[PDB]
């Protein structure tokens, strides 16, 4: 065991010296000893992310590779061998990873308790995370995953979760992946808030739904934005006491009708959990004045909500959304063991066994 | 007098129908007639955007012109004849103008008070402002200006400020052009809050740090980041207690070097007014748990942001710099009108 490990895992940086793991070229992904604030993980599945999994397939067939499953798993083996971590070189792009506890650091910054042998998750990328790939069993090109025996590290300001041994592995992990999303919406919605949810059928979106109305209480009020009639049930099984068709790209009529629905008061809290571009300017235009616009997705542009807002004179707060949170896991799956009708709709969309 | 005008300005709109007035491509400038909740200006200047009048300057060129003032003046004439306002049909961007206050609509959502003859500057594009120009009298090719005489409405919605006639127009738009981030910081800041300013010897930077300093108090601690020693002394006059010497994008450094200075206690508040690009995580990490990051530079990127927190499990929130936040102009000016440090040091770098 080594000593003054870094938290933030700068000791096993190789190169360029002083960077941190993530911007990094080359990792340590030496398994033979730990640092004494690390965990260490019996990999036992990859799941890549999709879009660097699809680039790296598709710049193997334009190679002239044959074999696909076997140019990948070569291609991931040198790879990880080379810069000691899965981070897609032209992409930047990494995933995640499934694994059982096998050591822990007497100095690791303990999060979800956890001990030796556990079944956990990492809820950090790949492209930070130090990683051993001794064999690659199976490369199952239809769900960018690769089955593997190897190791990983976790960091101490690394994140995890405990897998739950009662739920469908990939229930937990269709849960984790968004799990910020609801966490974020408790500390955001008070009692009697109006919440406009844009997306609000989709995965993160009927979870914000449910915490939205849960916080909102009684005399609150949560409306969903969608744009297919086919989702309204959804929307309001999970929470939203109205439901507005629109595209979420369409500012002029989420503004009118978030104000028919609420007598041109508008909405205290707007929580966007779309995955497409240019909705900041209607997501800014649904709140009050002074109101809170949470933006989830990946897709929001940092100069189009900023603009946006000023174009309108929009004093409203902008917040970029953080898929971290203290206890996210653990509150997001919370969420679904209160709501049956949540965990009804998560396991029909998202179980893999039925 | 029209009635019932859309606060947005959507009445405006000729093309497309169902889009707002920025994204439109065609606008009506017909100023015969304002609405009731509109504000009518007399254009006096139109700023135009740097990089739209440099790429119209260059157009015109290739197009084989020779008297650029001329060929852009008469540019510009059919650009707002045709689509009514000067939104660059390339590139998107606009520019502001200054002017006075020609008539005011009885239902105008007035924000700071003006009357007709007022002299003001628009806080909102010109891309989204029905514009008609009736003579360009002056076109300026370094100044990316044109003296006019024109029209232009404001919507309900828009932003302006009253441009005071006792201090230098150009210090007083640079004042204007960087409001919103005092505005913004004098809402974050508690007392004995430490605030750490990253680019603190900037335009807006400097405001920052003396916003910070007034609102954390005496018994607060407001630290600038700066890569130049020869900055020190003015990070400090406006209001820095420490400054740290690192490159915005040396998360490591800035990281230690706060630690140090805070007793391993970080940032309650992190403003980043730097105008580079890769500061995301270094502002992060600055901060305590729970603690507030405000990204003001038109550089941060949100996926580097949000990305960049839940990498190293940073429970910190993290704001989109508005720029614009209610009374911003008159709370700018006033900080200058107070602290006679900034006043000299604005008057000295910006004309
Ligand atoms: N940082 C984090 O950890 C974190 C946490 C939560 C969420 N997110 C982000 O939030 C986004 C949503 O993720 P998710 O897993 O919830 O995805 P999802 O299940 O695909 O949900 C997206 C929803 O948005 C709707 N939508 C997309 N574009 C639309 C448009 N133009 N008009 C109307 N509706 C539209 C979709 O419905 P249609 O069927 O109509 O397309 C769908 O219901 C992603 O960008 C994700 O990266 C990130
Ligand atoms: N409209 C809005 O929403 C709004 C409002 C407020 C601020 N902002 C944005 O804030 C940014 C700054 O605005 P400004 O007018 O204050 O610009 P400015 O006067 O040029 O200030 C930028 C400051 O950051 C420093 N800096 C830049 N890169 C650095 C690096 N890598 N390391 C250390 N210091 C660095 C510069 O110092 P050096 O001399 O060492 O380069 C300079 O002092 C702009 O992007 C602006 O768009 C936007
Ligand atoms: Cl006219
Ligand atoms: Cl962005």
Not at 84 to 105: C, L, P, W, Y
Not at 140 to 165: C, H, N, R, T
Not at 215 to 244: F, H, L, M, S, W
Request: hydrophobic share 40%; with cysteine.
């Amino acid at each position: 065991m080594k000593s003054n490990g870094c938290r933030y895992g700068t000791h096993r940086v190789i190169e360029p010296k002083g960077v941190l793991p993530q911007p990094a070229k080359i990792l340590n992904n030496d398994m033979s000893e730990i640092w004494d604030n690390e965990m260490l993980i019996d990999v036992i599945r990859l799941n890549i992310d999709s879009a660097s999994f699809h680039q790296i397939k598709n710049k193997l067939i334009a190679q002239g590779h044959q074999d696909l499953e076997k140019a990948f798993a070569e291609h991931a083996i040198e790879l990880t061998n080379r810069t000691g971590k899965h981070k897609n070189e032209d992409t930047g792009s990494g995933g995640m990873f499934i694994g059982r506890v096998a050591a822990i650091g007497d100095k690791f910054e303990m999060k979800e308790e956890v001990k030796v042998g556990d079944k956990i998750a990492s809820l950090v990328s790949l492209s930070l995370t130090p990683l051993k790939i001794n064999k690659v069993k199976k490369v199952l090109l239809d769900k960018d995953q690769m089955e593997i025996e190897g190791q990983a590290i976790l960091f101490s300001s690394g994140v995890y979760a405990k897998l739950p041994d009662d739920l469908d592995e990939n229930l937990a992990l269709s849960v984790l992946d968004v799990a910020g999303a609801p966490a974020q919406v408790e500390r955001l919605v008070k009692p009697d808030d109006t919440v406009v949810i844009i997306g609000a059928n989709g995965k993160s979106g009927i979870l914000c739904n449910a915490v939205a109305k849960e916080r909102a209480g009684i005399c609150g009020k949560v409306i969903g934005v969608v744009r297919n009639e086919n989702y309204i049930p959804t929307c309001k099984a999970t929470g939203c006491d109205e439901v507005i068709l629109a595209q979420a790209t369409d500012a002029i009529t989420i503004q009118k009708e978030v104000s028919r629905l609420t007598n041109g008061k508008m909405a205290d809290v707007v929580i966007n959990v779309v995955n497409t571009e240019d909705t900041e300017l209607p997501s800014i235009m649904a709140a009050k004045d002074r109101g809170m616009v949470y933006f989830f997705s990946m897709a929001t542009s940092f100069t189009k909500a900023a603009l946006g807002a000023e174009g309108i004179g929009a004093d409203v707060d902008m917040m970029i959304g953080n898929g971290y949170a203290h206890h996210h896991s653990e509150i997001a799956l919370d969420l679904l063991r209160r709501n049956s009708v949540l965990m009804k709709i998560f396991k029909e969309r998202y179980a893999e066994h039925h």
